[model samples]
Target chain A: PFEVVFDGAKEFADLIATASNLIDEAAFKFTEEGISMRAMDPSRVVLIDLNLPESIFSKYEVEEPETIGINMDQFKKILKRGKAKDTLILRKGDENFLEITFEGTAKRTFRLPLIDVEELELELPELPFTAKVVLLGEVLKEGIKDASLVSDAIKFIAKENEFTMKAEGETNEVEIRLTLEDEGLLDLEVEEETKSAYGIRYLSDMVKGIGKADEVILRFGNEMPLQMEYMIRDEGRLTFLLAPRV
Target chain B: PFEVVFDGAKEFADLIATASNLIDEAAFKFTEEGISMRAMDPSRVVLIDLNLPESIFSKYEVEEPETIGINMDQFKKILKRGKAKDTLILRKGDENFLEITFEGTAKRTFRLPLIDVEELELELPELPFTAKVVLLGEVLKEGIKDASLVSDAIKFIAKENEFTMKAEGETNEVEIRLTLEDEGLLDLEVEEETKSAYGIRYLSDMVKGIGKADEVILRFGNEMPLQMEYMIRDEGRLTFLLAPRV
Candidate 1:
């Protein structure tokens, strides 16, 4: 038996909502210390690593370590019904279903069916990046949106003092330039001038999941997958790796 | 030739947006005093009477009374691009298009093609209603949404001191009861008990057009069309007559 109670459901709901965009189903491993999930998008275009510590939850109880396969899309749909500040409880009993409950002005409970997913001991890829930067997530979010209006794919260019997102269509092109002087740029490091191209659709959906993130860390190399990381408040961290378009 | 300027475009945009849901095209009559339009939904289930007086406009000029048919949906889409506090200007030149301009940080102008429409002096029906009540628009909006979840049709019940909205599906039902004690209910008067049913879809869209109206006045009788009226701030009044379902 496993049960976890959190002070609010909105944060959890947002994470799942973001994950479900790329991953339809995910195996969440719950342990005495915390919860963790690793999954890859269907097309293998992106990889997601998410974790939440027990400290974030008001109550955490587990008789034994357990890993369960959940239809993330379905879970998110149910989670969204919870108000932002509502107390949320997630539990798995003897039944084959996972139970979710939200305590607002009234108590609403939803039961979601569990799925069988063969859990593979997947490991995060060890990769080297020549460029890394941290910036306000909203700036990146807006940059992705602006790029999308111009093309299906966007190119990221990083130099010693500036980072840029550029996209070009047959007739229109968009570019967002950020430098040390920009309020949104927090940090920038470049061993070499690195640039990469990624599909806008994937990046756009990825940022949406990180909704309202204060700062996001981006690491990349020439024509390599972009590694993106951000905190889920102070409770946990979410990481995404999106492969290059070309 | 006619020219009109308003302090804000949001109010005008909202009215057009709401009208477009039921009316694809409409003939707006611009006179020296103000602007008015009358259009019935293609299904003839509802009739919209929208008006804005000269007092609402910061500047109103008219060489002669002019009536032009406009694609309300297309017109609304462009109007929405203007911010709520943005100054809006509408004019017609020697060309066969109407010009819309929004002055904000930068001036953006859009040209909309004018279409020919036969102007029919549509007269308002003189109808008698035994029940009339005024209440917060938000209350009615929510009541309509609650009813929609249960069925495609909703019934309204009015008494001397009470007004109720009810809907019943095959297996579920929803009802919203309001009275003098409720803060949303401002006033009620009934010569006799009255109840009528109408399609929920039309009412839902109609209410959405009303957007954030502080209060709405409803007048109806048993098996008769419902007449709803509300102010467009201090600027103008909008009225709708929705036919009974039965």
Candidate 2:
């Protein structure tokens, strides 16, 4: 008998909404440390990584580490029924199934039959990040939205005390330049130079889940996967990573 | 002969909105045989009426009217600047004066300017009715919506017989019964004879602009206002006085 309860249902719902848009299936691993899911998009050009530490939950108890495979679309449909104000509770039933309950003014609950998934024994490689920036979620979302109107790929560059996002296409081009002199939603500036390209569609899908988050931590290296981390509540953190195009 | 051209403008904005709110402002004159407005809404209601003679303008003249008075609140602003799809020409030299010319995309040239309103004489006799029904707009709006949840409001009725909207302080009630013999949005019958009540607000508001039509008309003695006209549209015929509220 194992159970985990979270006060922030919206955060989990948002995470599922973002991940489901690009990937179809996901394996969530629950361990003594926390819960994490990492997967790559079909083209292998985009990778999504999410981790929520056990500290985020008020009551986190694990008798053994367990891995649960879920159909992302079905999981999203279940999460969509939850209200933002509800507290979420996940419990493991006798039949190796998971029950998700949303407790609020109205109590709604959903149960999903778990599937056997082949866990990848491969170790996670150490990411050599060339650049990291702490920015406001709204600002980044706006920049992405503007760039998405022009092209499917957005180029990110940090140089000369400035951060920029540019998208160029056959018909139009969009560029959003943020300078250090005028502090943008960006709060922290570390490395001087790094550039990477990412799929606008994946970024757009990921940002929709970050609406409630005020700021986001972005990390990237040249031609490497981009990692975005958002803090939901004091106890909750959601991260999304996307690999760069060739 | 000072003249400047503007894109789109109209004077009947406020009056048009106010007149749509279950209030009558138009009266017909037999002598002039034209429409006119001479009514005050003591309850802060706005009054507007228009009259058009078939011979008001000569056959081929595209000049603007002498002057126009407009209420700024009623005008929908066009935020973008471009060659207007339509143009209005104003003769006043003062830049403070607002004048506009409207040019349609098609050949139907529609133009009207503000004119001196004349008092119209109407010979409408006082209406006498034996039956009266009072109902709240929210209740009626909900009842129609709920009934139409299954079918359209084709033959809705509100009377002493079967269907009635009863409201107290906090609770509101809507009772609708359908028999095999009847059809439409509502169908109910009673052994006892019932008095009069008229049409649903849904169909009534579908005309030019009559969303705030609150008062339910009472039809009695068979010869009352065949329809209680809610004057809306500008000089346009937008009155609804059905024979019964069913």
Off-target runs (Cα >4 Å) in candidate 1 are A1-246, B120-125, B211-213
- Interface RMSD of candidate 1? 7.9
Across A116-159, the per-residue lDDT of candidate 1 in tens digits comes to 98765666567799999999988999999998899999999999
Docking quality level of the chain pair in candidate 1: incorrect
DockQ of 1: 0.04
Every candidate's lDDT? 0.85, 0.54
**Model 1 misses residue B23 by how many Å?**
1.0
Strongest candidate by lDDT? 1
lDDT of 2 at A164: 71
Structural similarity of chain A in candidate 1, as TM-score:
0.95
Candidate 1: Cα lDDT at A4:
95
Assess the local accuracy of residue A65 in candidate 2 as a C-alpha lDDT between 0 and 100.
85
